[PDB]
Amino acid sequence: HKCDITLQEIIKTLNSLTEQKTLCTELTVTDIFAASKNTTEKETFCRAATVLRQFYSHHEKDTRCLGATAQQFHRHKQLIRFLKALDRNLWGLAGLNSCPVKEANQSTLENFLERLKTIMREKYSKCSS
């Protein structure tokens, strides 16, 4: 369970998300990693899944994000697609739907994905010889 390939599914999704600039990757999410490290692994995934869900719900039809061009509209749809896939995988990992996230700090979505990526790669590394 712990070292399941969902880890890889999440990482590969993170690679696509961070190699991807849009109009709205600088918009913010609550920085659940501004905590002082106080929670289990399932709480962490649940919290990450929560704030990402917050983001895609709120920015899927956001006029600031939707795009003028074909390419901008394509990239926005891509992003929302990848957040949902990531989110799906995080929730599957979390095994938990209810978890209060209490942080004041916001980071850009972009910074938050890089941080989640680091942690995910660390989990994988810890699993692997």
Author numbering: 1 to 129
Reproduce text from the manuscript describing this model.
Signal transduction of IL-4 is mediated by a sequential binding process, initiated first by binding of IL-4 to its high-affinity single membrane spanning receptor chain IL-4Rα. This intermediate ligand receptor complex then recruits one of two possible low-affinity receptor subunits, the common gamma chain (γc) or the IL-13Rα1 chain, into the functional hetero-trimeric complex to initiate signalling.
Changing Arg85 of IL-4 to alanine does not change the binding affinity for IL-4Rα dramatically (KD (R85A)/KD (wt IL-4) ~ 4.7-fold, thus ΔΔG = 1 kcal mol-1).
